[PDB]
Amino acid sequence: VSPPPPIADEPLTVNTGIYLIECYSLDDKAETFKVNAFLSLSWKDRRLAFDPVRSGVRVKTYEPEAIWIPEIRFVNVENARAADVVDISVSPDGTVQYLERFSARVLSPLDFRRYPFDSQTLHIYLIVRSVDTRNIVLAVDLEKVGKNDDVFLTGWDIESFTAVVKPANFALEDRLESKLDYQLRISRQYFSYIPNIILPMLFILFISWTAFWSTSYEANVTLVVSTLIAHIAFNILVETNLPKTPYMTYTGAIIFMIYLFYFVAVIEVTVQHYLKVESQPARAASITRASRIAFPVVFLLANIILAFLFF
Amino acid sequence: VSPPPPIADEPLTVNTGIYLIECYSLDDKAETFKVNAFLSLSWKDRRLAFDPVRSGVRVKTYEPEAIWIPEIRFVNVENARAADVVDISVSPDGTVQYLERFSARVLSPLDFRRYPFDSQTLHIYLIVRSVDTRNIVLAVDLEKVGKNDDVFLTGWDIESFTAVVKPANFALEDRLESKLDYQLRISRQYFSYIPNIILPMLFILFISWTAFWSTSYEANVTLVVSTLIAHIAFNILVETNLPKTPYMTYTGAIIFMIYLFYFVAVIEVTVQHYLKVESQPARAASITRASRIAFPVVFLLANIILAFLFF
Amino acid sequence: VSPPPPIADEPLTVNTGIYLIECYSLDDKAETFKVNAFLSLSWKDRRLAFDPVRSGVRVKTYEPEAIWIPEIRFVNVENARAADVVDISVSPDGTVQYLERFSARVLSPLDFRRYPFDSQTLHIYLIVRSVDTRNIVLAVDLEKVGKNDDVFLTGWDIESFTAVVKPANFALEDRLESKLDYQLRISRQYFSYIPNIILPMLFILFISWTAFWSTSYEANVTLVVSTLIAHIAFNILVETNLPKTPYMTYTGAIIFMIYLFYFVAVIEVTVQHYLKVESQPARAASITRASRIAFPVVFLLANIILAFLFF
Amino acid sequence: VSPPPPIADEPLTVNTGIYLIECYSLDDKAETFKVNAFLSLSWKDRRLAFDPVRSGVRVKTYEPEAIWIPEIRFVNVENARAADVVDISVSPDGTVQYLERFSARVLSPLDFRRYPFDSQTLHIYLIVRSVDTRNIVLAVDLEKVGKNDDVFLTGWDIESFTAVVKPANFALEDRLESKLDYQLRISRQYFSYIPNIILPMLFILFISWTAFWSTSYEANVTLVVSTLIAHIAFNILVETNLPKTPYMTYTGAIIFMIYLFYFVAVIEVTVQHYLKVESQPARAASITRASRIAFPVVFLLANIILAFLFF
Amino acid sequence: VSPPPPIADEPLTVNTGIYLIECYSLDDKAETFKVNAFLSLSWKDRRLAFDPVRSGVRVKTYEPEAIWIPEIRFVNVENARAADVVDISVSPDGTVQYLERFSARVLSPLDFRRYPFDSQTLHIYLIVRSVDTRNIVLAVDLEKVGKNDDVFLTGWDIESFTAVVKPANFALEDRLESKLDYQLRISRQYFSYIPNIILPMLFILFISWTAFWSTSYEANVTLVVSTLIAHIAFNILVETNLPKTPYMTYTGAIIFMIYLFYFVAVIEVTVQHYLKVESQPARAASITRASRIAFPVVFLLANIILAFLFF
Ligand SMILES: [Cl-]
Ligand SMILES: [Cl-]
Ligand SMILES: [Cl-]
Ligand SMILES: [Cl-]
Ligand SMILES: [Cl-]
Ligand SMILES: [Cl-]
Ligand SMILES: [Cl-]
Ligand code: NA
Ligand code: NA
Ligand code: NA
Ligand code: NA
Ligand code: NA
Ligand code: NA
């Protein structure tokens, strides 16, 4: 079979639409998500036209094999989509209405800069390669673009599913390619991070600061070192749920900065002891008293500065 | 092939039934479960009618390819079900009796609010898209809906497997869709959580309270900090077996609240030491004596309040 | 094709046999094992009968497509078995001898009560659905049931592979079903558990008891708390290699009970210190001296009681 | 199609050869490895013979479907090999030359007794089932057995790839089977184990022995207990990279024995303290002084004995 | 179908080109990467030639089945590539222009010597086996070799994608093979390693050196031992993200060397205490004062030497 012939030198417009049924498995480490949707295609093939009076029927159904169907592919998919044809319906003028149900593992990159308070735009790129007979251009039939109400992405809030109506037409290996951008806008459900990582991490830090109300070096060393190890465990736990980024993430910055607070606490604890031993407990008292205000104030201001830079 | 023709303007009724053989792999993190069942379908196709006298055979067997079979799909499956046709039997009036055995990874959401004392309703949604010739409606043949006695879901108790007999008939992309709801009611086997997480977690908390019967700051710091770290390990262990929820789970709440008890224990331990050093051991004694009653009482009441709010 | 016709109203007997080639991947958490075996089937089809004198040949070979083959399925498999036909041989009387090589992930439940000193009976269930023409019954050809000498299941000892010769004949969805039970009896190789979990766990417990020969509260607190944390690590490591059971496992019981010993050791250590501080070291001495005998004796008796209840 | 007819009563010899292209994924826990190789088969079928003068051609190419091909299977594979036919070439005498490229996950057991200083013999078993017409026997064409120079198995050294030329001819399910043994001899690259596990483990042990130059019980308890926990982490890390064996591995033995050294160090530390408190520091001094020599000497001799027993 | 006939004794040139669409999943442990690309092939088949005047058309399209297509395989792939034909176009002279879109898991080894400051050259090897009719040689059509601008490999920077234009022509199993080398040059994004592993690891080391400004043995033992354990956790974390190499990696060397610094710190701490107890605090003071300069200086020089040897 060959593509439909042009009335003039115009390209063939394949109207598209994606309707999400199930949306799942957003892997932050892999920057992938799995989708299960309907793909609808519509184009005019004058060769398929018929008189409804003479033929009796208003529409004719065909098996994929019988007629010409445009080779539509997804750009950012991992492996080729699993698709099963639901229906192919031809109207008297020759307008074909194709429908298939597919599933694919889509590879769309993520911006972890504001993690876990981040919002993402997932992409689904539809593409078509022009044949030698005629050039093929994609379009968006907005009435056939949507999502089911039940569509839930675990740990995420689905904001919108829209399509950038004007395709990206470009040359590739000396043939026209018409690319379409379907955008799924989502925002992370940060709630869990608060009682599981953020608040536990702040509690262990504040426990390290109880060393500023203690003259016992042995007890201080235990307080600051033990809590530093729990902070290492939280740093490791966090960096496992995330990929290696060439930029600093919000949680990454807080986690990093907190190491400096532990390092300075060890220095203060060491200075206090050295001074007490050197028979200068009055000077050690001044430093310890100052640290009680300095540490919370510098922590609070540094955090205001960070939140400002990141948001 | 085309769908059966109507006697009048009636829709075509496809009678359904699911009989679970094997039920397994309930992933709490993924909110998926795997199923291995029988799918039975039955509809009348007058075109397949035959005389048993002339044909020799009461029933005729056909290969799926030979006749028209309704395109029945599952809504909430991950990938398309793996199915193998067991039998297709046609009676002289044209009544088709389809049987297939399938396996699928079903995606049904879970409510972790009362975890690990939670009960779930897993869903299996059957659907059918109406063709242009005639509208297709699903039905439940209750005699062909059930589960095997051997059906075991590891770490869960299977309560019931029933079907909501009235289908959800709705419009989708300008065609009628007939959806059916099969519900598998299950309840978690919480027993293992008690000797593995709950009791170990309470033992480490009570060990931290032995600091209220000790004047040794160095020993108290070790007691409260060491047990706090074991609590962090239990928090990490628990949050690995669960997905990130936008709500507080029962175990999540207890785990969180216990951090506050560790934080207040560190404050008491610090106050006691400061006072002893400041040569006020009488005042430190009053606080320590009070804490011995306060901590268990406040822990017990807070837990009564939590159990009340959650159950 | 249709099933063989009966001489009288007798059912069709399909003689079966499974011969294990490779047995592997026993997942304790999933309660699954992978198998790679031969499946032999034998039944009489008089339509296939031939005279060896006239035909010249003693046996005739056929492709599966050419003749009727009973639809034999496995009940407790995860997905449908991967099978490849080795041979189909027909004798002059019409006796068909089918052979196929298959692989499947079998889902047979396990009893962890005596873990890691447990023995299991893995099951492979063969089933057949009766057709409308005639009822099909399964049988065991014991000469075609066995296992290869090389068959090794890592971390397990394979005791026997036998079949319960009388099939379970029952009604299902208004048709007769003939189920057969193939039993693979295995017993766990507990040896590794001794130097890796049991002995390390006992050593850390005995180290905690060196606190009964020490008057240093700070040292005792360190001894009992540090070793309690190592016991938590062993509890976590053990519960990862096992699924969540609604019953107590042998190792689970020992692990749980050892927590009580740590809890009572903390109480003794606390009492000794309180008494020493209260200027009653004589009474603290009596308690410490008693604990030296009490702890090992109660540990040894409690273990005799547990081993008795479990074995 | 039927097998080639015999000139006399001789069996049909299928000459074989395996040429490894890619060798990868050696799973120690699973005792599997993945292979990607060429399988070459050669047998004489007189029915395919032709005159090169009359036919013009020197060799004839055939599609697998066109001619009889022996059903060659792998014994110790997990699932059936993925194979794609490269070429089928017939010479004038009827000698068929088959070539296919395959990939399979091979299940060959491993001997961890000398781990990580172990050497293995991986096996690839080729087999063929005799048909009723005539018996089929395998052979090794040594010119068609080899491996690519690039063949690399990560963390292993590939020593040799040879075949045991005489097949194992035996009865199975009342038919003759001809098995062939292809052996891949490999040896572990132990280098990484030295700076990552062995030396770190020895350093922590030697740190525990600094307690023999200290009179501080509180410091000794910390030294011996802390280092014992790091040893537990190394034991856990090691037993994760390995399966549960019914025998003692070399690293397993060293790891186990080191626990005894920690246990005796705790006893010495306890004895020294008891004696110092009992006002017998002279006797405690003798024991501590002796331990300084005893511990390294007994450690060094015990290791000589172990290396001797294992190698 | 047979291969194209030669004009003379020349070999058949198959012009190739790979255009990367999606590049993903670089597994450091497995030394694999997944690719999703276009594979373009071009060769002349005079049998397919036509007159554009007489035929009307300028190019003719064919289904793969209709014409002869060279059997092109990938050498270093894990399993056979998943490919789907985009287009086959024949020009009047008989020049065939094949295009397919494929996906494969490529196995190309990595050099971890400079990790995480390493650069890699990933390889994609195209190969072709000569048939008996005529020898087949590969070529690189540079206009059909490239990569998409969007091509992103998580945690890596893609430098170049080029092809070594001269094929490696060699004999294999008595037939000519033409191999082509496609090279993807990438360099690791080391940024994340600095705040997550390197700086945390240096902070814990510097904390251990605060023991040179402390006379408290109990406190020093805690400081050096606690920080040594955190270093063990970082060593474990690092060796999990990497395979077992028969050489020393850059991070491996630093991590190893840091153990020696901990070991010497324990010796100093032990010597200081022994001397203080032996009533020689003046000599212990000299050693402690020297260590304050020695440790940072030796650490800094040793690191200069390592960076020099590795870069
Ligand atoms: Cl696609
Ligand atoms: Cl362009
Ligand atoms: Cl174009
Ligand atoms: Cl489905
Ligand atoms: Cl099956
Ligand atoms: Cl095979
Ligand atoms: Cl390939
Ligand atoms: Na088509
Ligand atoms: Na059909
Ligand atoms: Na059949
Ligand atoms: Na301590
Ligand atoms: Na064949
Ligand atoms: Na072809």
Residue numbers in the entry:
A (entry chain A), B (entry chain B), C (entry chain C), D (entry chain D), E (entry chain E): 5 to 315
What do the study authors state?
At present, the best structurally characterized pLGIC is the G. violaceus ligand-gated ion channel (GLIC), of prokaryotic origin. However, the GLIC is a pH-gated channel, activated by lowering the pH, with a maximal activation at pH 4 and a pH50 around 5.
However, the pattern of phenotypes does not allow discriminating whether those residues are involved in proton sensing or gating, because mutations to Asn/Gln also produced decreased proton sensitivity. A structural analysis was performed on E26Q, E26A, E35Q, E35A, E67A, E75A, E82Q, E82A, D86A, D88N, D88A, H127N, E181A, and H277Q mutants, by solving their structure at pH 4. The key mutants at E26, D86, and D88 were solved at pH 4, each showing a structure similar to that of the Wt. All structures were in the apparently open conformation.
